[PDB]
Design a protein around this ligand. Sequence first.
Ligand SMILES: [Mg+2]
Ligand SMILES: [Mg+2]
Ligand SMILES: [Mg+2]
Ligand SMILES: [Mg+2]
Ligand SMILES: [Mg+2]
Ligand SMILES: [Mg+2]
Ligand SMILES: [Mg+2]
Ligand SMILES: [Mg+2]
Ligand SMILES: [Mg+2]
Ligand SMILES: [Mg+2]
Ligand SMILES: [Mg+2]
Ligand SMILES: [Mg+2]
Ligand SMILES: [Mg+2]
Ligand SMILES: [Mg+2]
Ligand SMILES: [Mg+2]
Ligand SMILES: [Mg+2]
Ligand SMILES: [Mg+2]
Ligand SMILES: [Mg+2]
Ligand SMILES: [Mg+2]
Ligand SMILES: [Mg+2]
Ligand SMILES: [Mg+2]
Ligand SMILES: [Mg+2]
Ligand SMILES: [Mg+2]
Ligand SMILES: [Mg+2]
Lengths: 266, 232, 155
Amino acid sequence: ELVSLAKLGEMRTHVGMVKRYWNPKMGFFIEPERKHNNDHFVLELQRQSLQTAYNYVKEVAQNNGQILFVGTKNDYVKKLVNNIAKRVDVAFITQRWLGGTLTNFKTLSISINKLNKLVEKQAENAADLTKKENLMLSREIERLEKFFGGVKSLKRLPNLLIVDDPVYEKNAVAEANILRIPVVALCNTNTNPELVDFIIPANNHQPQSTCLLMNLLADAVAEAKAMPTMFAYKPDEEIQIEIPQKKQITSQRLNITRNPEVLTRE
Amino acid sequence: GQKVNSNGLRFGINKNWISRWTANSHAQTAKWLIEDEKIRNLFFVNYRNAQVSNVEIERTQATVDVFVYAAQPAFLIGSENKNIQKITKQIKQIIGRTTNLDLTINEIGSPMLSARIIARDLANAIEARVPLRTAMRQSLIKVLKAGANGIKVLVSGRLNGAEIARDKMYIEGNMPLSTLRADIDYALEKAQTTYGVIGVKVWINRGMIYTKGLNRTPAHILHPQKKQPNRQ
Amino acid sequence: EFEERIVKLKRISKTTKGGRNMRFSVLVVVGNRKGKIGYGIAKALEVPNAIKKAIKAAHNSLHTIEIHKGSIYHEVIGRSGASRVLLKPAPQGTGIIAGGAIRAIIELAGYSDIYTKNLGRNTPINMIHATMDGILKQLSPRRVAILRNKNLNEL
RNA sequence: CUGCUGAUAAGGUCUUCAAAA
RNA sequence: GGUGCAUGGUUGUCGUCAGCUCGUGUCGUGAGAUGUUGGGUUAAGUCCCGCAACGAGCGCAACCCUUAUCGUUAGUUACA
RNA sequence: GGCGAAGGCGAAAACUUAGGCCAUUACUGACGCUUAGGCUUGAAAGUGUGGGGAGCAAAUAGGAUUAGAUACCCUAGUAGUCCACACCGUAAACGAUAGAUACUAGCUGUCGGGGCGAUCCCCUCGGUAGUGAAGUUAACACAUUAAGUAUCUCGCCUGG
RNA sequence: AUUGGGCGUAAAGCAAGCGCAGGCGGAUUGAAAAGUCUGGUGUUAAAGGCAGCUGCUUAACAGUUGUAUGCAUUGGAAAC
Ligand SMILES: [Mg+2]
Ligand SMILES: [Mg+2]
Ligand SMILES: [Mg+2]
Ligand SMILES: [Mg+2]
Ligand SMILES: [Mg+2]
Ligand SMILES: [Mg+2]
Ligand SMILES: [Mg+2]
Ligand SMILES: [Mg+2]
Ligand SMILES: [Mg+2]
Ligand SMILES: [Mg+2]
Ligand SMILES: [Mg+2]
Ligand SMILES: [Mg+2]
Ligand SMILES: [Mg+2]
Ligand SMILES: [Mg+2]
Ligand SMILES: [Mg+2]
Ligand SMILES: [Mg+2]
Ligand SMILES: [Mg+2]
Ligand SMILES: [Mg+2]
Ligand SMILES: [Mg+2]
Ligand SMILES: [Mg+2]
Ligand SMILES: [Mg+2]
Ligand SMILES: [Mg+2]
Ligand SMILES: [Mg+2]
Ligand SMILES: [Mg+2]
């Protein structure tokens, strides 16, 4: 099968956030509460939702759809998306999601066409560039690459979106919903279930759980486009992973003291 | 506020002079300066249907040379060179029989991107009671389709016969007016309407002049052949 | 053949540091007279560009309309803000008993015989919103049969 | 770091229009 | 001769101050908002980061002239 | 932050006395909600008679400022502010939101009773606050203490 | 505004309470049948209204047939 239930339990993909931060509409994916303070999930629901999303993304990638991976979150998520893009040639937006990346696609298409033209001009090279103008062109290349390096490949609106956190990507999921594009996400007890189509009840704070699930989706894509897989349909000795640096791991949401009353009074 | 003349700011740097002569004394400098004005005004106010873009005048101690660039020189030519003699006699009366005239008609290539004839067409359409929005839109679209850079058209006056004067501007494309390197051709014309006078000013951008020099080169007369005669 | 007609052409304006910026706003209703109709409101410095943008918005936002015997199935009240529009089914022959924005919406949608009355405000955009809400809230007599496990509108 | 500090005749333009290219 | 309160053209002033807008997109029933605000740096809406905005035009700057050092070309009617 | 129906209530004590919250294997057995008319209370100012008068201060006098100052500032200053007994019955008397009843996500505090027993913290029943989706609104905003879904009764509104 | 409106900021919740009369009111059983529903009968003058037809050259108009509403009595229904 896809994964092992004890493996999910060990990667802690069945722990959400503190009970304080939760959307009541996500009560379906949480079993009746208990002395746990971090909103444990239902493992069968996790596996079922993951299998459904896997099947859909596999179908899209086999039928040659264009999927876009979006993480503009912690540096680990950024590097994870970059590695997944290296593994499979899917489009990605690791930097900030630009306003209207999908609903205003014409202007960003103009920008990426300009980026491609500048890139080929620089590659063709010329002695007229000298030093100053060459440096300015290189800096422009660097900026449009940092902000459009994953979008340059596509020429048309993508057929599917994969979001690491719908709460953080509220703009991206809103654009996907207004354009009627499928969007899958790793909901983490604080997300509105209506916006996401293929909900995957999961963790979003654990750098091991997010890595495992993101690599599972990438494994679906890579199997559909036919390379050897990475995590899916694999034993423990190859599924095992490490915990990034910098007793047990602490998925506790803290720092409530930085939420003061809005400036008021007269 | 007020802006300096686009032609006047660029004259003597990236634009040659329309009249090139050196007079003998101050008395002759005024006569020669007025005769050329009369000739140019003649060619512009009458024989207007030929779309005469510009006329340049070149004089020596005693010889007058006229270069008339026109879009449809067939009207100047006439039927088997008829009106040619009429305009030759008009010029000879203007300057004098004692001098030698060397009139030369030149077909201007790619006429559409010339502010003089664009403004003349604008004024003709205004005088012909053509609606202004349609007139400016069609002129702008044809100018752009001609394959040039931005064009800015300003039409001011008693607009559509109204009792309160307005002004309407259409810029379409980059028109750097502060830049001196740009090749900006500016023309201004008066549409004599039944309700008064309408002023049409057309700026047209025709690229950047990257070759240093006081022109000494044709300006958008070269894309097709520019060879018409009537000279000696 | 998506016919279009102009419902309102207002002259809106803002104030700047000396003078007033005046823009025309158009409310266009686009309908194919077969079941597709949308509305679009746009603002521009000139009427042609305003109309172009309004038509673009109306074609971007199109809604599906179902007709029964050329009319509306059941009496409905569309609410939008302070405008309430009452629609009532009519027998074949009475024609359009609508006037103004409701009439434009109904004709461009394709209905033949409708009884209408504007019970509230008379602002065209809100009247159009109320009319669209009333027509959209409508229930076909097959969805209710599916819901209640009846037999395709049989007794 | 709190002195003082009052008033401004009447009526008025200015959007013609999108039918459309 | 009248009407600059019927106009074209030209000009003063805010002010050589740094502003004025537009296309597409999004938010709002609507006027409208966003971009143009926020943090740094400038004479500058000059530029860079941030950012439901992405870009663009006019303005700013540079390209134009002259003064400040030098090389080369030429040496009369300069110099000698 | 607590109490009362509202006005309102803050040095200590005694006496008399009103209502409320929680749990009830107890009792009466629809006896309840609203309330035209009626009655009771009702900040401060004001009235009448008798006391009291430290401070403050309408009216009043003077000095300043000012074009003028019958005002803002200052120095004095009567009624009044205080008590008892009788009236007056008005307030931005405001949550600008009548009372009663049933239902409709959640999160964060705080106060009281009850369950456990160091505090702290957990649960239940209520009071009082903030944030907040559905829902409502012209918008601001309200949002289980509703301005939401509905019922009952009373009062009130119909351009300036 | 019974059908068919509202009272936080636009006109409109009495300053608050104790409250007689009035309006409304928990659950189940039985009776009667004052409201409610239904059948028969009498009547609601003619003209007028609506539908059909005839006659005026067609119409307006005239004539002709049908056409309700309420009350009373009597016979049943018992959900509110
Ligand atoms: Mg000013
Ligand atoms: Mg003074
Ligand atoms: Mg006076
Ligand atoms: Mg003037
Ligand atoms: Mg600004
Ligand atoms: Mg902002
Ligand atoms: Mg910015
Ligand atoms: Mg008192
Ligand atoms: Mg005095
Ligand atoms: Mg004063
Ligand atoms: Mg004193
Ligand atoms: Mg007294
Ligand atoms: Mg009162
Ligand atoms: Mg009070
Ligand atoms: Mg609130
Ligand atoms: Mg009155
Ligand atoms: Mg009303
Ligand atoms: Mg009021
Ligand atoms: Mg009250
Ligand atoms: Mg009141
Ligand atoms: Mg009571
Ligand atoms: Mg009673
Ligand atoms: Mg009768
Ligand atoms: Mg009759």
